[PDB]
Amino acid sequence: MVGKKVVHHLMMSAKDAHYTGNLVNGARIVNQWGDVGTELMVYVDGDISLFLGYKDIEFTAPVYVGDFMEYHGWIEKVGNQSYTCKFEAWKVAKMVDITNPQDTRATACEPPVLCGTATGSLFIAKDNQRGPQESSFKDAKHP
């Protein structure tokens, strides 16, 4: 790992529902990973970067309104103009019964439930590379 893991953490609201049955779409995870990758790029070379693509993405468990979610990302490799990262999505809390709209019961996921994994890469043009912006990334280096 280059630098530190970045962790996003937030709640799926009703506004994150996408398909019927309060089901959140898998792209909601990819949305967040885009922002996680962005934060990694700000720290490693001071640019918001452009996302190049994903080698793979697996959606491993469904996500619903009322789920509290964490999104983890870290840099595995610093290339020339590319940076290769790994990503995870974890569910840390949920409604007890999503099928009952009037049920307010909720609980923690112990252990958290893996909802997604990915490998993806981001781009910062050489002339946009400004060096580390955050202390845990001070030792990052290009080949």
Ligand X SMILES: CCC(=O)SCCNC(=O)CCNC(=O)[C@H](O)C(C)(C)COP(=O)(O)OP(=O)(O)OC[C@H]1O[C@@H](n2cnc3c(N)ncnc32)[C@H](O)[C@@H]1OP(=O)(O)O
Q: Does 20 bind ligand X (CB under 6 A)?
A: no
Amino acid in position 89 = A
CA distances from 30 to 33, 80, 88, 92, 138 (A): 5, 24, 10, 18, 27
In the complex, minimum distance from the CB of residue 37 to its own copies, in angstroms, rounded to a whole number: 9
Pick out residues in 72-91 that bind its own copies (CB under 8 A).
none
Pick out residues in 104-123 that bind its own copies (CB under 8 A).
104-108, 110, 120
Q: Which stretch binds ligand X (CB under 6 A): 9-17, 39-47, 75-83, 131-139?
A: 75-83
**Residues 83-119, buried b or exposed e (16+ Cβ, 10 A)?**
bbbbbbbbbeebbeebeeeeeeeeeeeeebbebbbbe
Partner touching 82 among its own copies, ligand X, none, CB below 5 to 8 Å by kind: ligand X
Contacting residue, 30, 33, 88, 121, with ligand X by CB under 6 A: 121
